[PDB]
Amino acid sequence: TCPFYKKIPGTGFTVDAFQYGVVEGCTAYFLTHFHSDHYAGLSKHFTFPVYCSEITGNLLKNKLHVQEQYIHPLPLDTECIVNGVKVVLLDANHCPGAVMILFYLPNGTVILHTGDFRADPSMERSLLADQKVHMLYLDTTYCSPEYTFPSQQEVIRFAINTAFEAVTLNPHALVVCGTYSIGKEKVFLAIADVLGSKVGMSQEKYKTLQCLNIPEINSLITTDMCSSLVHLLPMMQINFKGLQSHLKKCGGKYNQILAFRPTGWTHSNKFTRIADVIPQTKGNISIYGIPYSEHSSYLEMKRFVQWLKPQKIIPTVNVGTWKSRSTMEKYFREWKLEAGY
Ligand code: NI
């Protein structure tokens, strides 16, 4: 049974609620981004409208095989009417094609649903600037002050350097990057670009990347592994036994892997900076964890919400326990009292 925080009052609209069957009264199904928790349930057998970004559109048609008619792509940053309701999609700064949705209700209420987002000062100069938001459906993934991590540009710096170093010391070394969804494409594209290479991947992952409207993408990626010195692998495969195995397959063409596991937060964020990172090392395979986040840190979230001064906040993440629910409300109260809304 679809939860109340996946429904939008005074509409027949739902958001990311594709796993319950037909939600009675729902005329329209919004999908914020192509990640399997959010899309869980979609198939070729959907015959209700789906509204989403062009990019999320391409992924629905091409990866899940939804029929072109039922995908309604909308441009971003454009006042659009949908069943006589003004909506806007805004870039969520999450993974490719991810959006936040502004709902302008008939009664005069304005609601922002963030989806998954990494809050940023650039969003304060968007269309949000123009008017008051009464309700905020918030990605609370990292709503706890422990949750700090560096900026994406910081991480991309570290990564580029590490890789370019090792490759220039040993030109028969291979870069590997772990991956299991869309998101975090800048890690492998920035490396591949510093190294004079295309990125090489399985057929499935090439098909996934070809839907994302990346500029010049045909010059950046290949399905010919042999020709590439940056490879992608299933994140499941980024370990010693798995990297050993894969190092066999390349057939005496490289003598050292240098891998990256872009993760989110882990407990080593609490005690070690990004400029002081190390890898594990079982012989010639050296795995780096790097905390490249596509979710708001505590402070980023805090800033966004205190600028937005929403009259009410509704969490979409970590809502499954009363302890997390309670904990999160305390933070919302502090922000409000600090800020004087
Ligand atoms: Ni996500």
Side-chain angles (χ1 to χ4, degrees), residues 1-23 25-203 205-215 217-240 242-247 249-269 271-281 283-311 313-341:
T1 37
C2 173
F4 78 95
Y5 72 90
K6 290 193 177 290
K7 298 157 159 199
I8 302 312
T11 64
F13 299 164
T14 64
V15 173
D16 288 359
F18 290 98
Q19 54 149 321
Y20 311 101
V22 184
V23 181
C26 190
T27 42
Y29 290 75
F30 282 85
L31 170 65
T32 61
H33 66 290
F34 196 74
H35 273 166
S36 42
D37 283 7
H38 298 259
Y39 69 61
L42 280 165
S43 73
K44 67 179 84 189
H45 312 303
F46 215 64
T47 55
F48 297 111
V50 181
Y51 285 79
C52 54
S53 62
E54 183 173 21
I55 287 166
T56 288
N58 301 345
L59 281 163
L60 292 170
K61 180 199 162 184
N62 288 303
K63 300 300 298 178
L64 305 178
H65 305 298
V66 173
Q67 301 155 57
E68 186 153 309
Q69 68 199 134
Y70 307 114
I71 305 158
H72 293 263
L74 304 161
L76 311 182
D77 305 325
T78 304
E79 294 188 315
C80 282
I81 308 306
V82 168
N83 304 351
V85 179
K86 174 161 66 173
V87 303
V88 175
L89 316 189
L90 305 178
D91 210 295
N93 183 41
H94 185 49
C95 68
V99 297
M100 317 182 287
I101 313 162
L102 265 186
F103 298 93
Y104 299 68
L105 279 42
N107 72 341
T109 293
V110 184
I111 308 173
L112 174 58
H113 194 294
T114 65
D116 283 357
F117 94 129
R118 170 157 198 181
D120 193 83
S122 60
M123 301 168 178
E124 300 162 11
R125 284 167 290 285
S126 80
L127 291 202
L128 291 171
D130 312 24
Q131 87 301 278
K132 176 192 193 71
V133 169
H134 300 69
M135 306 190 88
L136 176 61
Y137 290 59
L138 183 62
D139 166 19
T140 44
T141 305
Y142 294 128
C143 186
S144 199
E146 57 269 44
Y147 299 108
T148 71
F149 35 63
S151 84
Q152 288 167 167
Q153 190 283 313
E154 284 184 70
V155 178
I156 288 299
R157 180 80 296 179
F158 175 72
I160 283 170
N161 283 8
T162 305
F164 181 93
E165 182 166 296
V167 170
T168 315
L169 291 167
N170 174 214
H172 305 267
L174 177 63
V175 177
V176 184
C177 292
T179 189
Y180 48 30
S181 69
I182 72 168
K184 312 196 187 165
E185 288 77 15
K186 189 64 171 177
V187 182
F188 57 78
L189 295 161
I191 295 164
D193 187 86
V194 90
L195 298 179
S197 192
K198 298 198 180 183
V199 184
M201 55 200 76
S202 68
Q203 270 197 281
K205 192 63 187 200
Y206 186 87
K207 181 184 180 170
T208 298
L209 302 192
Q210 277 294 171
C211 305
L212 315 187
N213 289 336
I214 293 170
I217 195 56
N218 284 342
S219 64
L220 311 185
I221 58 169
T222 183
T223 53
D224 182 6
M225 305 307 271
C226 290
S227 58
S228 182
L229 80 128
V230 182
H231 296 176
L232 302 203
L233 281 183
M235 195 77 71
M236 275 195 65
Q237 197 166 342
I238 310 290
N239 52 82
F240 301 117
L243 289 161
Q244 284 153 220
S245 188
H246 178 90
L247 189 57
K249 276 164 252 166
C250 287
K253 195 163 192 311
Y254 304 113
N255 53 359
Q256 182 211 343
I257 288 161
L258 176 126
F260 292 99
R261 298 209 322 122
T263 59
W265 177 96
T266 56
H267 191 56
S268 58
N269 269 257
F271 306 109
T272 314
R273 290 163 136 69
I274 191 69
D276 318 336
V277 168
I278 72 156
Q280 289 181 225
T281 302
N284 67 346
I285 303 178
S286 285
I287 307 169
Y288 285 80
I290 51 166
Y292 187 93
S293 180
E294 289 183 335
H295 293 274
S296 321
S297 73
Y298 174 83
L299 284 177
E300 296 168 345
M301 189 186 302
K302 185 177 182 276
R303 169 178 175 130
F304 174 75
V305 174
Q306 286 182 310
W307 176 85
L308 201 65
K309 305 174 168 51
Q311 289 182 354
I313 294 159
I314 302 173
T316 59
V317 189
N318 308 297
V319 301
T321 68
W322 299 114
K323 198 197 171 214
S324 297
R325 275 201 166 281
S326 154
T327 287
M328 281 184 274
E329 281 181 12
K330 286 173 44 269
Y331 293 121
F332 309 145
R333 184 60 62 197
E334 282 182 29
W335 301 352
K336 184 173 170 77
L337 287 161
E338 192 186 351
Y341 57 92

PDB file of all heavy atoms in Angstrom, residues 142-155:
ATOM      1  N   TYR A 142      21.384  11.427   4.377  1.00  0.00           N
ATOM      2  CA  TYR A 142      22.493  11.804   5.295  1.00  0.00           C
ATOM      3  C   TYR A 142      22.186  12.919   6.296  1.00  0.00           C
ATOM      4  O   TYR A 142      23.029  13.786   6.566  1.00  0.00           O
ATOM      5  CB  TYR A 142      23.759  12.140   4.495  1.00  0.00           C
ATOM      6  CG  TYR A 142      24.338  10.964   3.773  1.00  0.00           C
ATOM      7  CD1 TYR A 142      24.625  11.034   2.405  1.00  0.00           C
ATOM      8  CD2 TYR A 142      24.604   9.768   4.442  1.00  0.00           C
ATOM      9  CE1 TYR A 142      25.166   9.940   1.730  1.00  0.00           C
ATOM     10  CE2 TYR A 142      25.138   8.668   3.779  1.00  0.00           C
ATOM     11  CZ  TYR A 142      25.421   8.763   2.427  1.00  0.00           C
ATOM     12  OH  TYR A 142      25.947   7.694   1.775  1.00  0.00           O
ATOM     13  N   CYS A 143      20.993  12.847   6.892  1.00  0.00           N
ATOM     14  CA  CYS A 143      20.506  13.842   7.839  1.00  0.00           C
ATOM     15  C   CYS A 143      21.009  13.497   9.235  1.00  0.00           C
ATOM     16  O   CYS A 143      20.256  13.087  10.098  1.00  0.00           O
ATOM     17  CB  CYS A 143      18.967  13.905   7.817  1.00  0.00           C
ATOM     18  SG  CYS A 143      18.289  15.229   8.829  1.00  0.00           S
ATOM     19  N   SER A 144      22.318  13.621   9.418  1.00  0.00           N
ATOM     20  CA  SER A 144      22.972  13.426  10.713  1.00  0.00           C
ATOM     21  C   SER A 144      24.348  14.084  10.659  1.00  0.00           C
ATOM     22  O   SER A 144      25.115  13.857   9.723  1.00  0.00           O
ATOM     23  CB  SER A 144      23.089  11.942  11.104  1.00  0.00           C
ATOM     24  OG  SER A 144      23.320  11.805  12.492  1.00  0.00           O
ATOM     25  N   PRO A 145      24.669  14.910  11.652  1.00  0.00           N
ATOM     26  CA  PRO A 145      25.887  15.693  11.567  1.00  0.00           C
ATOM     27  C   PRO A 145      27.194  14.919  11.428  1.00  0.00           C
ATOM     28  O   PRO A 145      28.156  15.507  10.924  1.00  0.00           O
ATOM     29  CB  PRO A 145      25.868  16.546  12.845  1.00  0.00           C
ATOM     30  CG  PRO A 145      24.825  15.954  13.735  1.00  0.00           C
ATOM     31  CD  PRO A 145      23.842  15.309  12.806  1.00  0.00           C
ATOM     32  N   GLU A 146      27.247  13.626  11.792  1.00  0.00           N
ATOM     33  CA  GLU A 146      28.440  12.836  11.431  1.00  0.00           C
ATOM     34  C   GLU A 146      28.693  12.926   9.923  1.00  0.00           C
ATOM     35  O   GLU A 146      29.836  13.102   9.507  1.00  0.00           O
ATOM     36  CB  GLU A 146      28.406  11.363  11.890  1.00  0.00           C
ATOM     37  CG  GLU A 146      27.236  10.497  11.428  1.00  0.00           C
ATOM     38  CD  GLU A 146      26.089  10.531  12.409  1.00  0.00           C
ATOM     39  OE1 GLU A 146      25.776  11.658  12.866  1.00  0.00           O
ATOM     40  OE2 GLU A 146      25.507   9.456  12.721  1.00  0.00           O
ATOM     41  N   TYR A 147      27.626  12.862   9.119  1.00  0.00           N
ATOM     42  CA  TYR A 147      27.752  12.747   7.648  1.00  0.00           C
ATOM     43  C   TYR A 147      28.341  14.005   6.994  1.00  0.00           C
ATOM     44  O   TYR A 147      27.617  14.914   6.569  1.00  0.00           O
ATOM     45  CB  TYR A 147      26.415  12.299   6.991  1.00  0.00           C
ATOM     46  CG  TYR A 147      25.947  10.923   7.479  1.00  0.00           C
ATOM     47  CD1 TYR A 147      24.854  10.793   8.319  1.00  0.00           C
ATOM     48  CD2 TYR A 147      26.628   9.754   7.115  1.00  0.00           C
ATOM     49  CE1 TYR A 147      24.454   9.552   8.792  1.00  0.00           C
ATOM     50  CE2 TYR A 147      26.206   8.503   7.566  1.00  0.00           C
ATOM     51  CZ  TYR A 147      25.134   8.410   8.398  1.00  0.00           C
ATOM     52  OH  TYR A 147      24.772   7.145   8.814  1.00  0.00           O
ATOM     53  N   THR A 148      29.673  14.054   6.986  1.00  0.00           N
ATOM     54  CA  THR A 148      30.438  14.952   6.137  1.00  0.00           C
ATOM     55  C   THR A 148      31.137  14.107   5.083  1.00  0.00           C
ATOM     56  O   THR A 148      31.437  12.915   5.290  1.00  0.00           O
ATOM     57  CB  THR A 148      31.530  15.756   6.883  1.00  0.00           C
ATOM     58  OG1 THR A 148      32.610  14.896   7.287  1.00  0.00           O
ATOM     59  CG2 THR A 148      30.981  16.450   8.107  1.00  0.00           C
ATOM     60  N   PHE A 149      31.371  14.727   3.939  1.00  0.00           N
ATOM     61  CA  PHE A 149      32.285  14.179   2.939  1.00  0.00           C
ATOM     62  C   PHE A 149      32.785  15.321   2.008  1.00  0.00           C
ATOM     63  O   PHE A 149      32.236  16.415   2.016  1.00  0.00           O
ATOM     64  CB  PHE A 149      31.665  12.950   2.186  1.00  0.00           C
ATOM     65  CG  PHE A 149      30.192  13.042   1.952  1.00  0.00           C
ATOM     66  CD1 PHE A 149      29.683  14.041   1.162  1.00  0.00           C
ATOM     67  CD2 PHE A 149      29.322  12.105   2.502  1.00  0.00           C
ATOM     68  CE1 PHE A 149      28.313  14.136   0.929  1.00  0.00           C
ATOM     69  CE2 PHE A 149      27.957  12.179   2.277  1.00  0.00           C
ATOM     70  CZ  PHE A 149      27.450  13.204   1.485  1.00  0.00           C
ATOM     71  N   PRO A 150      33.850  15.076   1.232  1.00  0.00           N
ATOM     72  CA  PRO A 150      34.391  16.161   0.416  1.00  0.00           C
ATOM     73  C   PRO A 150      33.483  16.537  -0.790  1.00  0.00           C
ATOM     74  O   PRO A 150      32.462  15.907  -1.024  1.00  0.00           O
ATOM     75  CB  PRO A 150      35.727  15.606  -0.087  1.00  0.00           C
ATOM     76  CG  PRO A 150      35.838  14.232   0.475  1.00  0.00           C
ATOM     77  CD  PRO A 150      34.492  13.796   0.931  1.00  0.00           C
ATOM     78  N   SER A 151      33.867  17.582  -1.513  1.00  0.00           N
ATOM     79  CA  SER A 151      33.188  17.964  -2.729  1.00  0.00           C
ATOM     80  C   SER A 151      33.579  17.018  -3.861  1.00  0.00           C
ATOM     81  O   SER A 151      34.629  16.346  -3.792  1.00  0.00           O
ATOM     82  CB  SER A 151      33.511  19.402  -3.123  1.00  0.00           C
ATOM     83  OG  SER A 151      34.717  19.505  -3.846  1.00  0.00           O
ATOM     84  N   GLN A 152      32.727  16.969  -4.894  1.00  0.00           N
ATOM     85  CA  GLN A 152      32.954  16.070  -6.036  1.00  0.00           C
ATOM     86  C   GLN A 152      34.230  16.471  -6.778  1.00  0.00           C
ATOM     87  O   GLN A 152      35.033  15.617  -7.189  1.00  0.00           O
ATOM     88  CB  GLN A 152      31.753  16.042  -6.973  1.00  0.00           C
ATOM     89  CG  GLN A 152      30.543  15.300  -6.410  1.00  0.00           C
ATOM     90  CD  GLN A 152      29.230  15.521  -7.193  1.00  0.00           C
ATOM     91  OE1 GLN A 152      28.235  14.807  -6.988  1.00  0.00           O
ATOM     92  NE2 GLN A 152      29.249  16.454  -8.123  1.00  0.00           N
ATOM     93  N   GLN A 153      34.462  17.777  -6.868  1.00  0.00           N
ATOM     94  CA  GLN A 153      35.667  18.264  -7.529  1.00  0.00           C
ATOM     95  C   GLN A 153      36.928  17.877  -6.752  1.00  0.00           C
ATOM     96  O   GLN A 153      37.947  17.584  -7.372  1.00  0.00           O
ATOM     97  CB  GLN A 153      35.605  19.767  -7.780  1.00  0.00           C
ATOM     98  CG  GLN A 153      36.729  20.275  -8.674  1.00  0.00           C
ATOM     99  CD  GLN A 153      38.091  20.405  -7.955  1.00  0.00           C
ATOM    100  OE1 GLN A 153      38.177  20.957  -6.843  1.00  0.00           O
ATOM    101  NE2 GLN A 153      39.159  19.893  -8.586  1.00  0.00           N
ATOM    102  N   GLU A 154      36.857  17.860  -5.421  1.00  0.00           N
ATOM    103  CA  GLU A 154      37.963  17.350  -4.599  1.00  0.00           C
ATOM    104  C   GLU A 154      38.280  15.916  -4.901  1.00  0.00           C
ATOM    105  O   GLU A 154      39.447  15.547  -5.029  1.00  0.00           O
ATOM    106  CB  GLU A 154      37.672  17.466  -3.093  1.00  0.00           C
ATOM    107  CG  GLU A 154      37.816  18.857  -2.557  1.00  0.00           C
ATOM    108  CD  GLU A 154      37.627  18.921  -1.050  1.00  0.00           C
ATOM    109  OE1 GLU A 154      38.527  18.415  -0.349  1.00  0.00           O
ATOM    110  OE2 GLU A 154      36.606  19.507  -0.575  1.00  0.00           O
ATOM    111  N   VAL A 155      37.237  15.106  -4.973  1.00  0.00           N
ATOM    112  CA  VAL A 155      37.421  13.690  -5.186  1.00  0.00           C
ATOM    113  C   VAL A 155      38.009  13.514  -6.597  1.00  0.00           C
ATOM    114  O   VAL A 155      38.932  12.746  -6.760  1.00  0.00           O
ATOM    115  CB  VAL A 155      36.132  12.865  -4.972  1.00  0.00           C
ATOM    116  CG1 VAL A 155      36.382  11.382  -5.263  1.00  0.00           C
ATOM    117  CG2 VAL A 155      35.588  13.036  -3.549  1.00  0.00           C
TER     118      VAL A 155
END
